[PDB]
């Protein structure tokens, strides 16, 4: 009869159904962790859900504003004046300390992230790319070792493997989630394989249970690229190391670059900490114990900013799931008419990006006409597959690669604008263009 909102995706889907009266027979409390701060302030009173919240008016301030155009991700809309005020307030305390490399806000953010993820050890880093590189080194990756990964992620995933001399081995995706197909991983394992690197793409989690099953047979490490999936329930249950990004355009970000390494493995965590600061023994500067390292810890200043901005995470993820649901329901007719395929609602998705598939070769037409005739920006995350860049490396090593389902899906994929400070009037403008263009 009572759910305590933990700030993750499972409870956010349940809360939404309550708010929309799709259940209205359950009661909610909310936990006091920092990622719930804005949600608790906005939607709760004395740790009970406020009475008659109007999602459209109270959460999105729907007021029949007239819309002329839609940008896909206008960065000036992704931070709120309330966040800015809190950032200025905390920087007024950080700046006079002079502590701008390591510092107490870094440690606090590591503690918040560890609690939120239920992991023991957190190393906050200067980016998700750096987190991934360090984590590969900590598991003992050496030049020439093979890392199995999909070919449809952001370039950072493959780049971190290549930066340390290791070899991406691309495996195709499934037909349902844009995630690595686990039934194709075993075939790609070689004497040289050291690691499986699944990507929780667009905010949706891979089938980690089956991936872990294969990794245990072959004694392989799993490092999870969760850079788009913060807030997703049970993230990391099966991986050795989980990688986060706090890039400013992620569901949670700082005001600059940052990320994190998350693990329960103390051996790996200690090596990650050493490699992230020059190979030095922890808190013994200038004394190397590893052969080398990077300069890749988070900035204390960005950690302070992160501790302000993470207060909005639960609430902004709730707004994302509302918006994704609204797309799915309102484009359903285009799915019925076999013009598009839409994503489905699931408990794990945090909706960092909203993918649809435009069928029958029409994707480019729809994208171009959405822009030119309706002033609606859509985007393709990402426009070139890993084995298709026009680079010397591709011409040397991956000209043989054939990834059937990844390549076909790549001709169909289109992402719709979805970010938590968009107006519902802005989403309606996208909806009526997509319906209008499909006739």
Ligand X SMILES: Cc1ncc(COP(=O)(O)O)c(CN)c1O
Q: Catalytic site residues?
A: 250
Q: Which residues bind ligand X (CB under 6 A)?
A: 127-129, 153-154, 156-157, 199, 225, 227-228, 245, 247, 257, 259, 295
CB of 214 or CB of 423, closer to a second copy: 423
Is residue 426 part of the contact set for a second copy (CB under 8 A)?
A: yes
Residue for token pair 């918006």 = 323
Is residue 98 part of the contact set for a second copy (CB under 8 A)?
A: yes
E strands within 197-302? 221-225, 241-245, 259-263, 280-281, 284-288
Judge if the upstream peptide bond of residue 382 is cis by omega within 30 degrees of 0: yes
CB of 218 to ligand X, least distance (A): 24
CB of 350 to a second copy, least distance (A): 20
* Element spanning 11, H or E: helix 9-19
Contact yes or no for 126/256 (Cβ under 8 A)? no
CB of 131 or CB of 189, closer to a second copy: 131
E strands within 96-179? 121-125, 146-149, 167-170
CB of 108 or CB of 184, closer to a second copy: 108
Q: Of these, 101, 346, 368, 436, which contacts a second copy (CB under 8 A)? A: 101
Q: Which residues neighbour 427 within 8 Å (Cβ) at sequence distance 6 or greater?
A: 323, 326, 327, 417
Residue 228 interaction partner, one of ligand X, a second copy, none, beta carbon < 5-8 Å per kind: ligand X
Orientation angle between helical segments 104-117 and 300-309, nearest 10 degrees: 40
CB of 249 to ligand X, least distance (A): 7
Tokens of 140: 């003992």
Q: Which residues neighbour 396 within 8 Å (Cβ) at sequence distance 6 or greater?
A: none
CB of 197 to a second copy, least distance (A): 15
Residues 382-401 that bind a second copy (CB under 8 A): 382-384, 389-393
Question: Cα–Cα distance between 353 and 199 in angstroms, integer?
Answer: 14
Q: Of these, 64, 219, 361, 372, which contacts a second copy (CB under 8 A)? A: 64
Residue 264 interaction partner, one of a second copy, ligand X, none, beta carbon < 5-8 Å per kind: none
CB of 197 or CB of 339, closer to ligand X: 197
CB of 153 or CB of 273, closer to ligand X: 153
Q: Report the residue closest to ligand X, judged by CB.
A: 128
- Rounded to 5°, angle at Cα 28 from 209 and 26: 85
Using the Cα atoms of residue 320, residue 324, residue 325 and residue 327 in order, give the sign of their dihedral: positive
Residue 332 interaction partner, one of a second copy, ligand X, none, beta carbon < 5-8 Å per kind: none
Tokens of 410: 């790549």
User: Measured between alpha carbons, how far is residue 377 from residues 50, 72, 334, 352, 427 in Å?
Assistant: 36, 5, 19, 17, 12
Residues 165-194 that bind a second copy (CB under 8 A): 165
b/e map of 297-327 (b: 16 or more CB within 10 Å)? Answer: bbbbbbbbbbbbbbbbbbbbbbbbbbbbbbb
413 forms beta bridges with 357
Residue 292 interaction partner, one of ligand X, a second copy, none, beta carbon < 5-8 Å per kind: a second copy
Is residue 57 part of the contact set for a second copy (CB under 8 A)?
A: yes
Residue 227 interaction partner, one of ligand X, a second copy, none, beta carbon < 5-8 Å per kind: ligand X
Is residue 338 part of the contact set for a second copy (CB under 8 A)?
A: no
Residue 290 interaction partner, one of ligand X, a second copy, none, beta carbon < 5-8 Å per kind: a second copy
CB of 225 to ligand X, least distance (A): 5
* Element spanning 354, H or E: strand 354-358
Tokens of 345: 């609602």
* Residues 296-315 as x/- pattern, contact with a second copy by CB under 8 A: ---xxxx-------------
Is residue 295 part of the contact set for a second copy (CB under 8 A)?
A: yes
* Residues 145-164 as x/- pattern, contact with a second copy by CB under 8 A: ---------xxx-xx--xx-
Question: Cα–Cα distance between 87 and 248 in angstroms, integer?
Answer: 14
Question: Cα–Cα distance between 439 and 430 in angstroms, integer?
Answer: 15
Residue 176 interaction partner, one of a second copy, ligand X, none, beta carbon < 5-8 Å per kind: none
Determine the 3-state secondary structure of 260 from DSSP.
strand
CB of 349 to ligand X, least distance (A): 14
Question: Cα–Cα distance between 195 and 223 in angstroms, integer?
Answer: 7
* Residues 205-244 as x/- pattern, contact with a second copy by CB under 8 A: ----------------------------------------
CB of 394 to a second copy, least distance (A): 8
CB of 155 or CB of 183, closer to a second copy: 155
CB of 295 to ligand X, least distance (A): 4
Q: Which residues neighbour 313 within 8 Å (Cβ) at sequence distance 6 or greater?
A: 7, 35, 230, 231, 251, 252
CB of 65 or CB of 411, closer to a second copy: 65
């Amino acid at each position: 009869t009572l759910t305590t909102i933990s700030g993750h995706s499972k409870d956010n889907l349940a809360l939404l159904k309550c708010l929309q009266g799709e259940t209205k027979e359950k009661e909610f409390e909310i936990s006091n962790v920092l990622p719930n701060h804005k949600m608790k302030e906005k939607l709760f009173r004395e740790n009970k859900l406020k009475i008659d919240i109007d999602i459209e008016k109270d959460i999105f301030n729907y007021s029949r504003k007239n819309i002329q155009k839609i940008e896909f991700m206008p960065v000036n809309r992704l931070i709120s004046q309330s966040e800015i005020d809190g950032i200025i307030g905390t920087l007024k305390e950080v700046l006079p300390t002079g502590q701008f490399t390591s510092g107490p806000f870094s440690k606090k953010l590591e503690e918040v992230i560890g609690d939120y993820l239920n992991k023991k050890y957190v190393i906050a880093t200067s980016s998700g790319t750096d987190a991934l590189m360090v984590s590969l080194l900590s598991i003992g990756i050496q030049p020439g070792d093979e890392v199995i990964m999909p070919a449809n992620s952001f370039a950072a995933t493959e780049n971190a493997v290549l930066a340390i001399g290791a070899k991406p081995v691309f495996v195709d995706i499934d037909h349902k989630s844009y995630c690595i197909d686990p039934l194709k991983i075993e075939e790609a394992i070689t004497q040289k394989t050291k690691c499986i690197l699944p990507v929780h793409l667009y905010g949706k989690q891979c089938d980690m249970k089956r991936i872990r099953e294969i990794a245990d047979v072959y004694q392989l490490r799993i490092i999870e690229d969760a850079c788009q999936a913060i807030g997703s329930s049970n993230l990391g249950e099966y991986g050795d190391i989980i990688i986060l990004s706090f890039n400013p355009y992620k569901n949670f970000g700082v005001c600059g670059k940052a990320g994190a390494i998350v693990t329960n493995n103390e051996n790996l965590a200690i090596r990650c900490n050493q490699y992230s600061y020059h190979g030095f023994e922890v808190d013994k500067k200038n004394k190397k114990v590893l052969d080398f390292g990077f300069n890749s810890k988070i900035d204390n200043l960005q950690a302070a900013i992160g501790l302000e901005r993470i207060k909005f995470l639960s609430y902004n993820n709730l707004k994302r799931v509302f918006l994704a649901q609204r797309y799915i329901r309102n484009l359903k007719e285009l799915e019925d008419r076999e013009l598009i395929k839409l994503p489905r609602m699931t408990e794990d998705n945090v909706w960092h990006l909203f993918p649809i598939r435009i069928i029958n070769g029409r994707r480019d037409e729809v994208k171009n006409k959405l822009y030119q005739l309706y002033n609606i920006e859509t985007d393709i995350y990402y426009p070139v597959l890993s084995h298709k860049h026009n680079t010397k490396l591709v011409k040397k090593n991956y000209m043989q690669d054939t990834l059937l389902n990844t390549e076909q899906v790549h001709k169909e994929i289109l992402h719709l604008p979805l970010h938590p400070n968009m107006l519902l009037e802005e989403q309606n403008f996208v909806l009526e263009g997509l319906i209008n263009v499909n006739k």
